[PDB]
Amino acid sequence: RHNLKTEWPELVGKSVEEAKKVILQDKPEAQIIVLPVGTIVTMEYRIDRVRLFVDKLDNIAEVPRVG
Amino acid sequence: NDVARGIVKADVAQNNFGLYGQGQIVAVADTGLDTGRNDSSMHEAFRGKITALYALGRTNNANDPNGHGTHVAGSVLGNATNKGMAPQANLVFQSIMDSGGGLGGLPANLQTLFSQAYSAGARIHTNSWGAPVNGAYTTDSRNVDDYVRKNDMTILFAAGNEGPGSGTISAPGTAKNAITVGATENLRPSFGSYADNINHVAQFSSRGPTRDGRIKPDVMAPGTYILSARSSLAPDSSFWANHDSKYAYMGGTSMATPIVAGNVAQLREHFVKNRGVTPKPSLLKAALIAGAADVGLGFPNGNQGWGRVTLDKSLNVAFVNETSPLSTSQKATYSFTAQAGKPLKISLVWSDAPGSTTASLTLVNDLDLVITAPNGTKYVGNDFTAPYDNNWDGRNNVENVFINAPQSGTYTVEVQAYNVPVGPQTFSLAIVH
Ligand SMILES: [Ca+2]
Ligand SMILES: [Ca+2]
Ligand SMILES: [Ca+2]
Q1: Are residues B38 and B105 in the same domain?
Q2: How far is the CA of B376 from the centre of ligand 3 (A)?
Q3: Any transmembrane segments, and where (chain A)?
């Protein structure tokens, strides 16, 4: 009965640790990776991955989405 | 790849025109390439066709434990089974994966990356990567633009996988002078909803406009469930699904991009061998755009750009190849003979001066396309609302006039230099009819 959720605009500005709990609550299979905002990455789509892009305070810098 | 080949008409280019990319050299900057050794150990898709294999990210190690780069390069030019679009082109591979798993082998100034590839003979350069900066024009975007204007290298970038929301284009996919590629679906329907309609834009594909309101991506190609070369070092987890020990499935704008890169090699070969010219980057891009197919969403469009690559329509465009430099207030005027009963598509493209990373608009030199029909009806570039000559474009370095039901007679095709502060500015035109 989980609602289909693939983006988390509400997590912008939150800590990485707070973000991870919400994402796992919505998407138990998520493989979460943390990277500095602005990092260059490969552009393949991985349906179970969630990249978190963080600022220098380790707060979520942009909208987390699946892929 | 085998299904994508038919979708983008690479099969028609090959079978009816003999275009497999022979004599062309494509550079791919990506993770690594199979074993990382240009010898008999190399994956069959690339063995014997590697012009250069450079290790940038890890000292003396260009191998591919991830699998991304090997799959990507397979889609450009793999010559075993599940072949790339230009399987007789040779490869320059720049391994940019660092020892921390990222792409830290990229140099701070991307012109360094392009220059190394250019020196090895590559005239096409393809990049299935980006920073997801939501339409920003970054220093990387600026360096791509500066490079393309200075050198006859066609550079392609993935649009990003940050859709379906608007304004999600990654950098350097936001560069004005790159060909930016988004993903439609491959037709492998046994896999379900991601590979069931060749007109569907992949849900993850980044969407325009750019931050300054430009149309990106430029063109689309299949980018879901693409079957291509599997690195001998990569685990199952790197792929969407398995196939065999040598080939597996992946999806992303990462996969659409190299398909188009291969098509560009086929197209470049055609001009060079059969049309008497070395086509400039702007012309290759204009020819792909004019020949592209509306997937059904119409133009203008932030989801499909200018449509899905349809290579056979691009091959024999009537053209201008940067042969008329313009300064402010000058113009170049041409004629084209149309016959009623079939569409007329005219694309103007220039490799603009590099834009500013802080200004409202990235466009520097502003050219306008002005078309006049045999009965006097006027159209200006990118004005798709009637009347078609009142909304002038001052943001894009791609301007199009697409007339579904043209008149018989002489069309005037005019390029006007509205404002060229960094001139002169050359341009290319491609006409499909
Ligand atoms: Ca679909
Ligand atoms: Ca203009
Ligand atoms: Ca109008």
Answers
A1: yes
A2: 16
A3: none
- Cβ atoms of B409 and B337 within 8 Å: the answer is yes
For residue B277, the CA-to-ligand 3 centroid distance in Å is 36
Contacts of A45 in chain B (CB under 8 A): 161, 202, 204, 251-252, 254
Q: What distance in Å separates the CA atoms of residue B171 and residue B111, rounded to the nearest whole number?
A: 15
A44/B132 touch (CB, cutoff 8 Å), yes or no: no
* Ligand that comes closest to the CA of residue B196: 1
Integer CA distances (angstroms), B271 to B77, B249, B264, in order: 19, 32, 11
Resolution at which this structure was determined, Å? 1.9
* Among the bound ligands, the one closest to the CA of B186: 1
- Are B288 and B378 within one domain? no
Tell me which method was used to determine the 3D structure: X-ray
Q: Find the discontinuities in chain A where C to next N exceeds 2.5 angstroms and give the residue preceding each.
A: none
Q: What's the structural domain count of chain B?
A: 2
CB atoms within 10 A of CB A57: 9
* Half-sphere exposure at residue B145, Cβ-oriented, CA atoms within 13 angstroms: 26
Q: Is B125 a catalytic residue?
A: no
Q: Which residues contact B161 (CB under 8 A, 6 or more apart)?
A: A43, A44, A45, A67, B132, B183, B204, B205, B206, B252, B253, B254
